Design a protein around this ligand. Sequence first.
Ligand SMILES: C#CCNC(=O)c1cc(Nc2cc(C3CC3)[nH]n2)nc(N2CCN(C(=O)c3ccc(O[S+](=O)=O)cc3)CC2)n1
Ligand SMILES: C#CCNC(=O)c1cc(Nc2cc(C3CC3)[nH]n2)nc(N2CCN(C(=O)c3ccc(O[S+](=O)=O)cc3)CC2)n1
Lengths: 242, 238
Amino acid sequence: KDAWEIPRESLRVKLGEVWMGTWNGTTRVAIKTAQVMKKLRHEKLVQLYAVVSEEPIYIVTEYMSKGSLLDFLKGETGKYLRLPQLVDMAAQIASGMAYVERMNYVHRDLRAANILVGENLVCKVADFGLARLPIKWTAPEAALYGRFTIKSDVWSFGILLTELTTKGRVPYPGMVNREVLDQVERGYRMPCPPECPESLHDLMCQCWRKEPEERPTFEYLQAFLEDYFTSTEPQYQPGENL
Amino acid sequence: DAWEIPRESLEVKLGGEVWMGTWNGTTRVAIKTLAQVMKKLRHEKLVQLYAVVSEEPIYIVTEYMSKGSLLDFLKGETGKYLRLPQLVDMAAQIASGMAYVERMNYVHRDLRAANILVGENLVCKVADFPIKWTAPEAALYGRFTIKSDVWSFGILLTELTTKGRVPYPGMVNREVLDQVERGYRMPCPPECPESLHDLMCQCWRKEPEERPTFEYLQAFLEDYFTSTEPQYQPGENL
Ligand SMILES: C#CCNC(=O)c1cc(Nc2cc(C3CC3)[nH]n2)nc(N2CCN(C(=O)c3ccc(O[S+](=O)=O)cc3)CC2)n1
Ligand SMILES: C#CCNC(=O)c1cc(Nc2cc(C3CC3)[nH]n2)nc(N2CCN(C(=O)c3ccc(O[S+](=O)=O)cc3)CC2)n1
């Protein structure tokens, strides 16, 4: 064992198998019941508090109040979410992934389901169970050949942008996995979502490139979305949904 | 108007009379012997009106649905093999029809399995235009709105998940009126996911305004097995 190890009795309501418990009677934690979540440490990544190595293996992390990003968009709160908040959340995710990027790691499962919302629309990347150094979300070179890179996470980020601009609607509506695999290889890309700016949709298609090394880095993705409503879309005005 | 047709071209009696026949010798139709609203409403998930005979004897010609009603289809021999994936799919198709009704500012006032028809490839459409099905604010005070059709949709989800069993088993209309108003809701039916049952209780809110729209209901059922229940596995009944 190591320094991350804690006794199984040191930590004291179900959520979805992750529970909301209490660590040392003063810390609000979350317990999910590598050595990859330990090394990675960023404000936009869900922080690991402690680990249990005895059966059953526990994972003690920080607590996010608003839950999953997918539930948050589909939920009652998500219908008032406009583009300024949505691009801001995308920027927060792209911030953590940029950290993951320069750390030379791969997430291999970047999607709204694995992103948690907290107070003040704070979004953090979670679940590094497949992390190393979902076909509708996965890059084709990874869903076929197992070529998982940071540029395969950019593809998923491109898919993620559709979930945000549609409030959590499943990518490629009406299509099944084998139907997606066939269409994507043929060049089919998801069209510009209703009331979504083309500059944002262009960024999607850039994340959806046949050539992995032609997809832009998360450092670019972060900078593009953070400076969005000034450099790219300063003429923006509110609509019915976006 | 312009919906009129010559009295040509009835073959068999389906089930005020309902017949399966032919129109103009080529197209298969459903003749109802013996309104003005079915002329305005057009949607792929609403039973489409074809033609009308205005003078007595009155005759209504709509599209034909082969599997009869959704209620008979569930209780019947085919409903025996119906699993939840196909059941949530049928519920999504209906919600789509009611979402059209919703954005057209209309009310159905009788959303139930008896008033929903099934065709080939498990296609379900709303038709026609019952205290166990209708909302209490509509049953007592007469407040029929689209959010009162959402209540019925909540009841509709029970029929689907129980193969068409009458809601509130062992209870009469007097029992239902009092219990529901007392806060009583139907429990989670056997082998039915609690997420789906939560959606039922949403459609069964006391305040009509807090009940979700059919635009929401449609999306929740369509993305159900990816967003809401990804780890679903087949059972004996559901
Ligand atoms: C609004 C409101 C109330 N809040 C919640 O209802 C609420 C709060 C929360 N806060 C948390 C948890 C964590 C810990 C890193 C988890 N940090 N902050 N999390 C969740 N959800 C539920 C749905 N979820 C799942 O179903 C799942 C996915 C993968 C998974 O893989 S794992 O390898 O076993 C096993 C479970 C994921 C978490 N839900
Ligand atoms: C499996 C199998 C064989 N299929 C059928 O046995 C079969 C097929 C069908 N297909 C249809 C009908 C329609 C038209 C809307 C009728 N489109 N597609 N309909 C029915 N029916 C439903 C309804 N039934 C009624 O009796 C009634 C309805 C309203 C009504 O109100 S109206 O204002 O008078 C007064 C009576 C009785 C069986 N039954």
